[PDB]
Write a protein that binds this ligand. Sequence first.
Ligand code: FAD
Ligand code: FAD
Ligand code: NAI
Ligand code: NAI
Lengths: 160, 160
Amino acid sequence: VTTEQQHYRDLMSAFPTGIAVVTSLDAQGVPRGMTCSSVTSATLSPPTLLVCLRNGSATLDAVSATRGFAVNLLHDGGRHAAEVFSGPDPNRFSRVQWKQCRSGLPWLSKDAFAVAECRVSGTQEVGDHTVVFGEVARIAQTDGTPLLYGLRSFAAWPLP
Amino acid sequence: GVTTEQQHYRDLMSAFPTGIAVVTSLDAQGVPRGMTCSSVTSATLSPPTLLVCLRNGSATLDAVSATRGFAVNLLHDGGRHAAEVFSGPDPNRFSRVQWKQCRSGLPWLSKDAFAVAECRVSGTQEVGDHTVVFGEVARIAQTDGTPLLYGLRSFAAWPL
Ligand SMILES: Cc1cc2nc3c(=O)[nH]c(=O)nc-3n(C[C@H](O)[C@H](O)[C@H](O)COP(=O)(O)OP(=O)(O)OC[C@H]3O[C@@H](n4cnc5c(N)ncnc54)[C@H](O)[C@@H]3O)c2cc1C
Ligand SMILES: Cc1cc2nc3c(=O)[nH]c(=O)nc-3n(C[C@H](O)[C@H](O)[C@H](O)COP(=O)(O)OP(=O)(O)OC[C@H]3O[C@@H](n4cnc5c(N)ncnc54)[C@H](O)[C@@H]3O)c2cc1C
Ligand SMILES: NC(=O)C1=CN([C@@H]2O[C@H](COP(=O)(O)OP(=O)(O)OC[C@H]3O[C@@H](n4cnc5c(N)ncnc54)[C@H](O)[C@@H]3O)[C@@H](O)[C@H]2O)C=CC1
Ligand SMILES: NC(=O)C1=CN([C@@H]2O[C@H](COP(=O)(O)OP(=O)(O)OC[C@H]3O[C@@H](n4cnc5c(N)ncnc54)[C@H](O)[C@@H]3O)[C@@H](O)[C@H]2O)C=CC1
């Protein structure tokens, strides 16, 4: 017995999350990234998160080529960035402010309140996606109200 | 206990808010087990598969591994007490919430959850002291409700 895809979409839509832009570099050195809601903590020993990226995506290809990626947590002013990095716009990085970290990884310096640089420590394919484990290597974090996505809409963390 | 490094990582991940589920199963002797879970993540639509990340040695992970199935109970904004009890030290948590047994046997938190998804374990991946559990969704029931949220070390309600 297996549920239908629409019922599953409706279920998962009702689990709201923060919003990241996951970034890396492709083999040509070109920044790549996507809006990502699948950031999940895996373990503290060593500090490891995971993301789940669509197979064939430019971002997964860059993550695999660089074996590292940055997780840029968006604050409430970052809705436009989240739209850019989930939509059909070309040259997404020309539409946001960004800087290259010491690692070379793209950091969204205006739209994110925190950025974690991760080394790819393993992957696991599941259907048409790949779970990517990231061992966190460097963190820069400031105060900010997190952007949220849930029930097919953007919102803001409701507490000061 | 945590190291300084691990604390910086907790500070980061705390700023990625999520909905809140209670993941339930039965142990080998039929006893209901469950825990508060913020690691619910969508993996793929083909077939519909989510994942959760459960601590190794937890009663819930042992039950999930025994029975190869589990329920994901998404809590609505009246469910804070259930989330607190299912994240605390008391093994008699099931006597402190109102619940019902699904036809399959899985525990359903009927008073505190607005949705329940019954899952078959389709794979696992150990990562440090945790196990990522892949759940192929077999059945979903859902009603309207405002999702409970957790972020920045606080409960809140979805604001829209
Ligand atoms: C709130 C939210 C959360 C999301 N979370 C996740 C998640 O956790 N995991 C995940 O895998 N995806 C997620 N997505 C979807 C993801 O952000 C988009 O699919 C994104 O476009 C992928 O970017 P990419 O460059 O890696 O992929 P590609 O599909 O390889 O796109 C490459 C480039 O082509 C352009 N492009 C974008 N979309 C299209 C299109 N439809 N047709 C043609 N060209 C296009 C853009 O310039 C893009 O950079 C999420 C989307 C939203 C809105
Ligand atoms: C907001 C929030 C989100 C969380 N998200 C996650 C998550 O995504 N993943 C995760 O792994 N944890 C998560 N936790 C932690 C998790 O909810 C707690 O660790 C929870 O108490 C685990 O329950 P358990 O019964 O499976 O674990 P256990 O630690 O096995 O048991 C809890 C208590 O019951 C006792 N006990 C266990 N089994 C038995 C038995 N057979 N007989 C007698 N006593 C027994 C234990 O000694 C302990 O005192 C989260 C906590 C919070 C607050
Ligand atoms: N690839 C992914 O993991 C995700 C992709 N998206 C995509 O973003 C767009 C908008 O999403 P919503 O506004 O939430 O409406 P929606 O109704 O399409 O999706 C609801 C929820 O279902 C899950 N989901 C949807 N498509 C998925 C996919 N292809 N793979 C895995 N899980 C998926 C996610 O939890 C998503 O938030 C859609 O194109 C959706 O596919 C959104 C979230 C996760
Ligand atoms: N085991 C898990 O995956 C999780 C466990 N918890 C438990 O609840 C407690 C309180 O959490 P918060 O109030 O958010 O404050 P916190 O500062 O203790 O934790 C902040 C965040 O760090 C991550 N994290 C913490 N402990 C973790 C662990 N053992 N494994 C993986 N990721 C972990 C989670 O994303 C958590 O929300 C944590 O200290 C922990 O015991 C909470 C979230 C997930």
